[PDB]
């Protein structure tokens with residue numbers, strides 16, 4: 001596979017000065033609903049509001065002196081942008097960030113990212129910047145270094161809760177779940193890894209059922225971080241090391257988000273709540289994975305969400 | 319004073335099996351805005367969504383078997399109602415919770431959630447008290463104070479025992495104030511551990527009786543209150559006032575738009591789903607009043623007590639359910 005336990009441990013050593021060891025939270029009330037013990041790995045509390053700084057940090061700090069000196073570049077409309085900007089700030093090198101985009105821009109400026117605006121056009125702008133500067137491209141999902149950084153989530157989780165027997169992971173490009181599964185399977189081959197995916201962007205579930213990478217002409221989900229398709233380095237992990245993809249609709253995602261805010265008191269983004277929706281779902285509850293499970297890790301992947309509606313009403317109230 | 323370091327340590331041992339040791343969080347972004355290092359003590363992650371289970375657990379578990387046999391009773395439209403119901407549930411005893419009939423549906427649900435025996439009342443304090451008195455007469459249940467008692471103050475002081483162990487370098491603590499139970503416990507424990515620690519209250523402009531009381535040199539009340547900080551509308555009690563008078567350096571008064579700004583920052587930067595009352599410590603830390611004060615110049619490492627996360631976000635959810643439909647359309 002594109003990463004392994006060795007590369008993941010190298011990642012952990014490399015990024016440990018720069019990322020938070022994020023907390024695990026639980027709730028007896030949610031536990032009762034599911035009928036199992038849930039452990040929420042809170043990457044919403046990671047630097048920049050999501051897990052992606054791990055992969056971005058590993059990618060950037062892994063570059064030698066010669067390479068990194070040209071800066072880094074990426075095009076992104078989401079959490080990857082801020083992650084690259086922060087990782088580059090920590091390394092001391094420029095980050096050229098081609099946007100787009102929603103708030104997610106403010107997070108890049110916060111880290112001194114050099115924003116180069118896009119309108120196709122994303123790739124052309126990213127392409128021109130690369131040709132002229134030589135800046136190294138940092139991938140949101142599909143590389144050894146970001147997969148490896150992402151797997152550190154599993155190293156921490158299994159230190160924090162060593163009896164975890166199943167892990168539910170949100171899926172988009174599959175970087176997070178690939179790193180998580182690779183690290184976890186290496187520490188304990190009997191751990192079950194399950195993906196959580198929205199109905200209107202259910203390519204990963206289709207892919208697994210079809211035995212081949214499926215792409216979709218469009219996607220239809222409020223889980224804005226979950227609209228990508230699998231890459232050629234992540235699909236093999238999804239195919240071989242992930243038992244199943246639990247598919248849930250957006251209403252279930254919102255229902256789960258509501259629970260995160262109201263019960264856990266964690267201000268997650270919709271994409272970060274989907275693991276809980278999966279754990280609450282009939283599809284999961286009526287399955288063998290459920291019957292065999294006892295202690296389930298849930299990766300709460302981020303918390304970057306625009307709640308401007310809320311604030312407007314409050315300021316209107318006066 | 320009504321409590322002391324020994325009471326608070328007895329509280330710690332008594333409640334340790336029943337409450338969460340809550341985490342401390344920080345943010346380099348917020349630190350740069352204040353110009354200081356902030357440490358958020360997250361009582362929003364405490365059982366029942368707030369710190370009050372500490373005081374309520376202490377009060378309930380301190381009782382002997384016969385005392386508790388007739389149950390416990392309180393009156394509250396807020397977080398205290400649920401804290402008493404939970405504490406009572408943890409010991410396996412009845413809780414008579416006197417609630418006004420017009421109390422938020424969310425706060426009633428939090429009581430039902432813990433199996434509280436609800437006794438309904440009219441909205442005035444006099445009504446709540448009249449009902450609370452009759453329940454005590456009919457049952458002999460023992461009254462659990464939200465603010466003004468040794469056991470409640472001692473339980474609240476465990477917040478400081480944790481926080482000062484978790485971040486020993488803390489030199490100032492900003493604490494939301496309403497009846498003054500939290501800040502009294504926090505101050506008594508913190509000062510005993512380190513008498514040079516600065517304790518600051520954070521209070522809404524539309525409910526600034528603690529600030530008025532400090533200036534007057536005795537307990538002052540207001541003819542009404544006017545704040546979105548719904549847990550901060552009470553007045554000081556005769557056991558909390560002495561501690562506020564002697565051990566709290568200053569009351570930082572902020573308006574409701576500052577509170578909303580600080581709540582927004584809690585959500586967007588810290589990723590913590592606080593209630594408005596729980597954000598006021600950050601509003602205080604961000605204020606001109608604080609930044610131009612002597613306390614700011616003297617301070618370096620500042621603890622902020624994030625006191626709770628129980629807030630009705632119905633408006634958010636309604637908009638989200640609407641948005642996902644349109645999105646599929």
Ligand SMILES: *Cc1c(COP(=O)(O)O)cnc(C)c1O
Nearest residue numbers: 079172173174175176225301302
């Ligand atoms: C990108 C993202 C994911 C999915 O990550 P992949 O590695 O693309 O599967 C999940 N949650 C959040 C918050 C994200 O930003």
Ligand SMILES: *Cc1c(COP(=O)(O)O)cnc(C)c1O
Nearest residue numbers: 397496497498499500549625626
């Ligand atoms: C009650 C309450 C306070 C105030 O506590 P006192 O002991 O009355 O000063 C602060 N924050 C929250 C969230 C509360 O419920």
Ligand SMILES: [Mg+2]
Nearest residue numbers: 201202203204
């Ligand atoms: Mg998908």
Ligand SMILES: [Mg+2]
Nearest residue numbers: 525526527528
């Ligand atoms: Mg007041």
